[PDB]
Amino acid sequence: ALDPLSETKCTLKSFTVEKGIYQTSNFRVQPTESIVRFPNITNLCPFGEVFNATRFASVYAWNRKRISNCVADYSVLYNSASFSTFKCYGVSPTKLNDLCFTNVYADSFVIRGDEVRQIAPGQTGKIADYNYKLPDDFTGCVIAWNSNNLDSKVGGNYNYLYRLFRKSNLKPFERDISTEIYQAGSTPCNGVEGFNCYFPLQSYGFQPTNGVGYQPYRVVVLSFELLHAPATVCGPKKSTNLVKNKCVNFNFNGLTGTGVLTESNKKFLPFQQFGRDIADTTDAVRDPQTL
C-alpha cells in the first residue's frame, strides 16, 4: 500500500519489476446516496372510528371492523398522546409500519382494570379464555384509555355485559354470543340458574368510586392474520428526491440495485414498470409517480 510500484511487486509476488505495462488493480465507483421512490401512500383507514367511538359493543359481542386494502399508520396512535397506557409484544407501534400482512382487525371492548393484564398472547384468565384470546403468533399491540368519567354510572353501569363461564376455551379472536347455561353438576338446569347452574352472561358494575382495579379501560387489540392471500395492509413510507447521473443506491416500487440512471428514448407500455435487454438482464426503470 505504499506506491503503485510496490503494488506491481505484490501483483507478481516478486521483489523486482521488469520493463513493460502490467495490470495491477481495477477501479470501481462506490455508492454515495440512497433514493426511495414508491407509489402513493394515501388512503389511510380511519382507525379512530373504532378507538374514539362514543360507545363500544359488549365484551362477549365485541365489535369487529375489517381493515384491508389500505395503508395503516400506527404512528398517529402513539404520538397523539390521547390515551393513557399502552402495551405491545415483540414490535413497537412505530416499527409495526414496516410489516405487510393480509388483514387487520380492531377488536374493541371495555373491561376492568385488573383484567387488562390478561390481554396477552398465550394468556389465561376471565377475558383471555372466555371472551377474547390472542394468537400465539401475535405481533401487534393493545391500546387502552381510562374512561372512568364516561363508561361509569352511579349504582353500576350494566350496559356492558360479559361472559364469565364456558364449558371449553375459545380460539384466537373467536366471537361467540351464545348464552348456554354453564352446568357444573349432573342435574339439568332446566333453563334457570341455581345450585351448580350459573348463567355465563353477566353485567359490569362500573362506578366512579371503584378502585383502580375495577375502573373501565377502553381496550382494543390490533389482531393480525397471515392467510393464504398476499399481504394487503402496509404502513406509510416517505419518498425522497430522484438522483440522475451519479453512482448511488436505488430503490423503486419493486426494483432495487446499484447503478447510474440517465435519460433515454424508451417508452414503456401503460402496464410495464421496468425493462430487460436481449440477454434477459434488467436495463431500464420507471418512476412510479412521474412519467
Binding site: L269, Q272, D277
Partner: protein, 264 residues
Amino acid sequence: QCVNLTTRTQLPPAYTNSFTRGVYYPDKVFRSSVLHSTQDLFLPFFSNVTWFHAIHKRFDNPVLPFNDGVYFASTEKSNIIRGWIFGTTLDSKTQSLLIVNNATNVVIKVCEFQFCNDPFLGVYYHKNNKSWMESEFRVYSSANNCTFEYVSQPFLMDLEGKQGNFKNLREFVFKNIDGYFKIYSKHTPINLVRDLPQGFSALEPLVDLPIGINITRFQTLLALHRSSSGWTAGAAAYYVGYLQPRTFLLKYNENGTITDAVDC
C-alpha cells in the same frame, strides 16, 4: 335467475381453424428490438377452436372444462359479451370468481355464489328511446364470505346495436398459475364476415387477481334483449380455445409492441 329461456338448446361443439390468434405478453417487462423466446400457456397456431354464437335459437352459455387456461375471442355488433364465471362447481359449494361488464363498471367478486339455471343480463324498452343500457341482473342469487372485491373506474360502453358485418373485437386470456390469475385483454375495431378476423395482435394486462382457488370449469355470461323466458339475444360470436405450454418467438419492435410470432 332459475327461469330457463324458451328457445336455447345445446348443439355439438363444432370446431374451426384459428390461424394466428392466441399470443400475448408473457410478463410486465419491457423489451424492444429483440426476438424473445418464452414458454408459457399459449394457443398453438392453426389449432382448432370451438364455434359458438348468440342469436334469437342457440344462446351458448354452457359450463365447459377449464383444466389449464383458455383463450377467448369475440366478434360483435350488439356487444353481447358481459362476463365470465369460474369455479370447481360454479356453485355455492365453494368460492367462485366472477367478472362482469355492465357498461358502467368492471366489477369482480369472490363469494359463495348460488348457481343460476340460466344467468344473463337484460336490456329492455327498445320501442322508442332505446338508450342501450343494462337494466336487470340475473348472474347469481346469493353470496357469502365475499373476501375480495375489485371495481374499475366509471365509464360508458357503447351497447348500441349495429348492422352489416362484425365490427368489434374483444379478446381475453384467462389462466390458473398456482391459484394466481393474470387477466389480460385487448379491444380493437375490425371488419369481418365469417370464421376469424385476418390479422395479428397481442393482449395486455387488465386486472391481477391473486385468489388461490383451483378451477376446473367456466361459464359464459351473455346479454339478452326484449322490446325470464321471453328474452332474445342479438348478433354476436365468440370462440373457445384451450391453451398449452408451448414456446413462441415474440418479435418485439422498437416501441415494445409484438409484431410477429412463430409457433415452435
